[PDB]
Amino acid sequence: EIVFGTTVGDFGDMVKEQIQAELEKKGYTVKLVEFTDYVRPNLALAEGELDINVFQHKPYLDDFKKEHNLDITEVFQVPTAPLGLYPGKLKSLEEVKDGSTVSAPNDPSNFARVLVMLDELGWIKLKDGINPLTASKADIAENLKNIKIVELEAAQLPRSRADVDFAVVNGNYAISSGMKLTEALFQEPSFAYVNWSAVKTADKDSQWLKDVTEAYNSDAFKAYAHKRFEGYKSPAAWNE
Ligand code: MED
């Protein structure tokens, strides 16, 4: 029995609609546990409540496992809903004003993504030569449009659109709140945040993980993903 943990929505649908049957064909049973937050899944994995989770990108994982002393590691990538800047009280990028508010996730690896996006938009200017994966407020050279960044817990970002001019929303929460990726005013161009599964390091060589990895890389899964998850960013290894 393989116990998966995912965030609600797209990553759990992948298990229930495609992966689970592929693994049952090989004699496994599958249990899915879903989470509404980003903090519990790696802790449940490390404590043995999960065998594998699918919810995070590698910058998040690298930071989280180091901070909390978790002996876990990434395995394979999965199709991922991209990060986007979405309309809030203002409906178009050209409407940005001096002092416009932008809501952003408050954890460091996802906050960096917002600063890189704001620099790409020309709303702020980051210093030269920084590490984009750890971009922080100290790396801002000039806040060109005096953007006020409103930092929130990531799950709160869809609801923040009533309170801020623009909202930068993680794809999993955008999808699960009924937002459409095509409604974004600007989508992150990077592929560094295509999400990874994670397991306890002790399990990296297990036969069950080999079978899970094959399930997420099958022709059938790719065909399903391309239809069910249009506009998602693909694993690098799919070589699309
Ligand atoms: C926990 S890392 C952030 C969530 C991830 N699904 C993303 O690519 O936005």
Author numbering: 44 to 283
Quote the study on this structure.
MetQ can bind to other methionine derivatives, including d‐methionine, but preparing these forms has been complicated by the high affinity for l‐methionine. Hence, to crystallize the d‐methionine bound N. meningitides MetQ, we developed an alternative approach by unfolding/refolding MetQ during the MetQ purification to remove the endogenous bound l‐methionine. A sample of unfolded/refolded MetQ was then mixed with 10 mM d‐methionine prior to the crystallization. Six molecules are present in the asymmetric unit of the d‐methionine bound MetQ crystal. Not surprisingly, l‐ and d‐methionine bind to the same site, interacting with the same set of conserved residues. This observation is consistent at all six MetQ molecules present in the asymmetric unit. The α‐amino and α‐carboxyl groups of both l‐ and d‐methionine interact with residues R156, N213, and N238 located on one domain of MetQ, while from the other lobe, residues Y81, F98, H100, and Y103 pack around the methionine thioether group. Short contacts to the methionine CB group are observed in both structures, with ∼3.3 å distances observed to the Y98 CO in the l‐methionine structure, and to the Y81 OH groups in the d‐methionine structure. The side chains of l‐ and d‐methionine adopt distinct rotameric conformations for the N‐Cα‐Cβ‐Cγ; Cα‐Cβ‐Cγ‐Sδ; and Cβ‐Cγ‐Sδ‐Cε torsion angles, which are approximately −175°, −175°, and −70° for l‐methionine and +170°, −80°, and −60° for d‐methionine; the latter values correspond to −170°, +80°, and + 60°, respectively, for l‐methionine. Consequently, while there are differences in the details of the binding interactions between l‐ and d‐methionine to NmMetQ, a qualitative evaluation does not identify any obvious feature as dominating the differences in binding affinities for these two ligands.
